[PDB]
């Protein structure tokens, strides 16, 4: 969450595959009155205020990007998610279908909206995970283990704000991310669990096994043999929504000399990956906020993928060119230099 910007994904709509994927997501989420394309097109800034639209559109854009990547043949070797994003990770790994993933995202948003819980702010602080948790005032818990250097804390609005101000008095890094006014992964989210569990059981019918490629971030490492971590059921989603995100813990498992692609409508976690991932790895955004035309940025990402040794054919993205080729096409033999 947190990487939703006005007009996200409009440039990619021109590509046939991405537009078809967005239409499929819309048809998936038709009964609830949400039209993904309509949400993307709306110009008013209010569209992203309601968390339902934000979550649904974010998941849809990630699914569309994964469809684009899979079109060229790129098969991921690993997968790491962050808060909501396991659903996108679920689809990328293959444990979930597009309809099921979009339904899960929308019902997460719906359940969270129904909560009507007291406002609780979640902000990031520059202190360390171990040190901060002791320093956390009662009722406030670290939000996400982004990295050793930077960690975010989520909790009740008043305690979070007071602690952030005191830390600023301490000079440490202070920032409250736009979280729709609701704290996340705290005991506050525990209220929404039952209805979410029942609705997701109604949504997901036949859970399927997880893969070794996927590295769950809602379950500590030692527990990867548990029943919840085995398959992506309602328990997996609830755990990913309740417990804090162990984003950094999964980065220690990234082998040296690896290509890391940020599947998101904004490479927010680029700094976290750069600092907490081994220097040998390369980071590629695949999309940026308020860029003039995101198709160029996606093509630049694919080009950097080409430069890094990973084969990817950009022909699949665009419509096929009919052969035989037109008479008079420039010769290719003279260009090959040895």
Q: How far apart are the first and last CA of the chain?
A: 49
Q: Which residues contact 151 (CB under 8 A, 6 or more apart)?
A: 124, 125, 126, 127, 128, 129, 132, 142, 143, 144, 145
Give helix then strand counts, H and E, for the chain: 12, 6
Whether 208 contacts 91, CB under 8 Å: no
Cα–Cα distance for residue pair 335/56, rounded to 1 Å? 48
- Please name the residue that has the structure tokens 């079109």: 71
205 marked ligand binding residue = no
Kindly state the tokens that stand for 70: 């899979």
Q: Which residues contact 303 (CB under 8 A, 6 or more apart)?
A: none
**DSSP structural state of residue 231:** B
Q: Which of 256, 196, 208, 213 is CA-nearest to residue 233?
A: 208
φ, ψ of residue 76 to 5 degrees: the values are: -65, 145
163 marked ligand binding residue = no
Q: Which residues contact 74 (CB under 8 A, 6 or more apart)?
A: 305, 310, 312
Cα–Cα distance for residue pair 83/208, rounded to 1 Å? 21
Buried b (16+ CB within 10 A) or exposed e, 61-82: bbbbbbbbbbbbebebebbbbb
Q: Which of 275, 301, 305 is CA-nearest to residue 287?
A: 301
19 marked ligand binding residue = no
**DSSP structural state of residue 29:** T
Helical segments of the chain, H only: 16-28, 36-41, 51-71, 86-93, 98-115, 129-135, 157-170, 193-203, 234-242, 247-251, 270-276, 294-307
Angle, helix 193-203 to helix 98-115, in steps of 10 degrees:
160
Asked whether the bond before 289 is cis by omega within 30 degrees of 0, the reply is no
Q: Which residues contact 240 (CB under 8 A, 6 or more apart)?
A: 81, 83, 84, 86, 217, 218
173 marked ligand binding residue = yes
Whether 61 contacts 13, CB under 8 Å: no
Report how far Cα 315 is from the mean position of its chain's Cα atoms: 26
Out of 21, 25, 57, 83, which one is annotated catalytic?
A: 83
Kindly state the tokens that stand for 143: 């939000």
Q: Which of 320, 323, 316 is CA-nearest to residue 302?
A: 316
Biggest CA-to-CA distance, the chain: 76
Whether 311 contacts 8, CB under 8 Å: no
CA distances from 185 to 36, 103, 148, 229 (A): 26, 21, 19, 18
- Whether the CA torsion 118, 124, 129, 134 is positive or negative: it is negative
Q: What is the DSSP string of 187-226?
A: GGGGGGHHHHHHHHHHH--S--B--SSB--SSS-GGGTTS
Cα–Cα distance for residue pair 276/272, rounded to 1 Å? 6
**DSSP structural state of residue 136:** S
Whether 104 contacts 97, CB under 8 Å: no
Report how far Cα 157 is from the mean position of its chain's Cα atoms: 25
151-154 vs 122-125, strand pairing mode:
antiparallel
Catalytic-residue membership of 83: yes
Cα–Cα distance for residue pair 303/279, rounded to 1 Å? 20
Q: Which residues contact 51 (CB under 8 A, 6 or more apart)?
A: 109, 112, 113, 180, 182
Whether 265 contacts 48, CB under 8 Å: no
Whether 146 contacts 173, CB under 8 Å: no
């Amino acid at each position: 969450m947190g990487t939703q910007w006005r007009g996200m994904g409009l440039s990619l709509m021109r590509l046939d595959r991405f537009r078809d994927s967005i239409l499929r997501s819309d048809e998936a989420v038709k009964p609830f009155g949400l039209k993904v394309s309509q949400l993307l097109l709306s110009t008013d800034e209010s569209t992203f205020d309601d968390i339902v639209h934000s979550f649904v559109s974010l998941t849809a854009i990630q699914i569309g990007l994964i469809d684009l990547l899979s079109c060229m043949g790129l098969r991921p070797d690993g997968i790491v998610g962050h808060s909501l994003g396991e659903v996108a990770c679920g689809y990328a790994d293959g444990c979930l279908s597009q309809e099921e993933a979009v339904l899960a995202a929308y019902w997460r948003g719906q359940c969270i909206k129904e909560a009507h819980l007291p406002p609780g702010a979640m902000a990031a602080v520059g202190l360390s995970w171990e040190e901060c948790k002791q320093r956390c005032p009662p009722g406030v818990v670290p939000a996400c283990h982004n990295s050793k250097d930077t960690v975010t804390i989520s909790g009740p609005q008043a305690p979070v704000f007071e602690f952030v101000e005191q830390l600023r008095k301490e000079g440490v890094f202070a920032k409250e991310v736009r979280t729709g006014g609701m704290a996340f992964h705290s005991y506050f989210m525990e209220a929404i669990a039952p209805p979410l569990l029942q609705e997701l059981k109604k949504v997901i019918r036949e859970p399927k096994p997880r893969s070794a490629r996927w590295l769950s971030t809602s379950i500590p490492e030692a527990q990867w043999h548990s029943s919840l971590a085995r398959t992506s059921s309602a328990e997996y989603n609830v755990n990913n929504l309740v417990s804090p995100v162990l984003f950094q813990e999964a980065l220690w498992h990234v082998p040296e000399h690896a290509v890391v692609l940020e599947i998101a409508p904004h490479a927010l976690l680029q700094a976290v990956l750069k600092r907490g991932l081994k220097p040998s790895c390369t980071i590629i955004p695949l999309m940026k906020k308020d860029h003039r035309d995101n198709l160029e940025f996606f093509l630049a990402g694919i080009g950097r993928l080409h430069l890094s040794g990973i084969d990817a054919n950009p022909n699949a993205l665009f419509p096929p060119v009919e052969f035989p080729a037109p008479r008079g096409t420039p010769l290719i033999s003279p260009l090959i230099k040895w």
